[PDB]
A paper describes a structure:
Gas41 is a small protein of about 25 kDa with only one conserved protein module, the YEATS domain. The two complexes share a number of subunits, including Gas41 (Glioma-amplified sequence 41), a YEATS domain-containing protein. Here we show that the Gas41 YEATS domain is a histone acetylation reader. In summary, our findings support a model in which Gas41 recognizes histone H3K27 and H3K14 acetylation and facilitates the SRCAP complex-dependent deposition of H2A.Z, which in turn helps to maintain bivalent domains in a transcriptionally poised state in mESCs.
Residue numbers in the entry:
A (entry chain B): 18 to 123, 132 to 157
B (entry chain C): 19 to 156
C (entry chain A): 19 to 157
D (entry chain D): 0 to 34, 41 to 156
E (entry chain E): 22 to 31
Amino acid sequence: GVTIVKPIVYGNVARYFGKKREEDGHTHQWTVYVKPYRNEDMSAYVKKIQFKLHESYGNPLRVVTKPPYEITETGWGEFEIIIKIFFIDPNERPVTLYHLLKLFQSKTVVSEFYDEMIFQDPTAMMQQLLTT
Amino acid sequence: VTIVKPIVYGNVARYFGKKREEDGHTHQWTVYVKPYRNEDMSAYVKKIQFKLHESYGNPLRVVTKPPYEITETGWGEFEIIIKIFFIDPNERPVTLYHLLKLFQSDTNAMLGKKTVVSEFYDEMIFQDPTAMMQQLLT
Amino acid sequence: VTIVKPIVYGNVARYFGKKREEDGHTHQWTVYVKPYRNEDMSAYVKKIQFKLHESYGNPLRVVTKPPYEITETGWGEFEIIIKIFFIDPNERPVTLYHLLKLFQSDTNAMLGKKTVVSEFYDEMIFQDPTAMMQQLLTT
Amino acid sequence: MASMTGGQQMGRGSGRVKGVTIVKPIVYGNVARYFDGHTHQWTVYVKPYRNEDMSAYVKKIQFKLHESYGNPLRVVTKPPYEITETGWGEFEIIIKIFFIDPNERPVTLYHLLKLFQSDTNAMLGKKTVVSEFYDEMIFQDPTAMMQQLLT
Amino acid sequence: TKAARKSAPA
């Protein structure tokens, strides 16, 4: 009968090379990430975070198992990244986030959002891991 | 003495409606150079090269006969370098730059336009062309 | 009857920009314990020990007066054990565990951040303190 | 509309609280960087050890510079409590902290301005010289006013 | 049992 809320921030940063790179035609370096809103060690209750990149990338399903939860790449185009957060308790269903990778400004480009992982009626194990 | 040939160049693109699963492509597009008027350029055009983005195989595409068009699928916008070569080696090639356009503007979308078209005008000017070229332009 | 003393603890770290030739150290860091607000812990804290990794010479670093900070250089991340001892020898020591953070995330590097910070909140709880301790905790 | 503001007890003392001691940790020192003919730019400063509003109980901070400076008496009345200058040499700066309560005697600090990098720091990526010290402002038996301003 | 690990980058 309890609900635990965990604030997070997620999104990406990007920087322009200044010109198209000759070998692959890439123009930007970028990093997509998920982090807690305030400092905590998320690995206490997070098993892994998958970042599903565009099909044009090799091994497009990128997985991070320990902080920081980030993936750094180069590219030339914007695309949707699917972020999937897995928990230590397999009985807690994964959280899915969608992020439009931003390369172009709407210095460095930042596109970041506030969100909340909501754990309603968590298992006893999960409630402990969330409150450490 | 001076011969003027109007041309149009640029691209059309059509949205698939969804990302294609296999390669993540979202659009089909065709980049082109066309005469403005209904006429044949091939008498004096040797070839037109379209340099695509490095992510395409054999990105330097060459068309030696009409229509001067390249049709592909893709997911991102990029700059294409277009180079027009003439039969007379004394006429220097014309280089054009085109941003391949995939995404409709909000203005055109609200107007209900079906497909994206990004088209630009130029004029090929042949001043005091060689007797050979003048023959080919006529 | 019950007194609460909030603290923060953890570390800051800064990259050399390069591996140092002599020892291969790459970062300077400071691990610390501080009061949450600007006040004096030393009235009731006798000493704070920071137990460093075995690769450090004299790894048990003891600080007997404020500020409760240890500054070092190194190349690796490891767990530091922090033990806070009180003026009342009969009040049990508080033990904290801290993973020393040195390596900046690519995200913070791109944001141009100059230092790494990993800091946590905690509370020292004194239940039914001796009369001496209650005086020291409330001056 | 209607509402109160705050109830304060009347007939209270305003002399010194004879059984209390309040401690305010501070940090002070300078930063310096190598570039008329001055060779270094430097900043001398005072800050609370944990961030708080010192201006609640600090009236002003005086930085007494070397005589070779014009108007060697520098006064800062709001944060940040810092003085920035250019020069060529290291010298002792006298720092005097004045309090809001006029009955409270000023606190004096002494700081040797550090301009020149040490070699250990030299090999590193350090481009700025830092010389910083910890101290504690001790208010034993503070005036009732100071006790409120300090808390 | 009583001694922990130290790890470098990458």
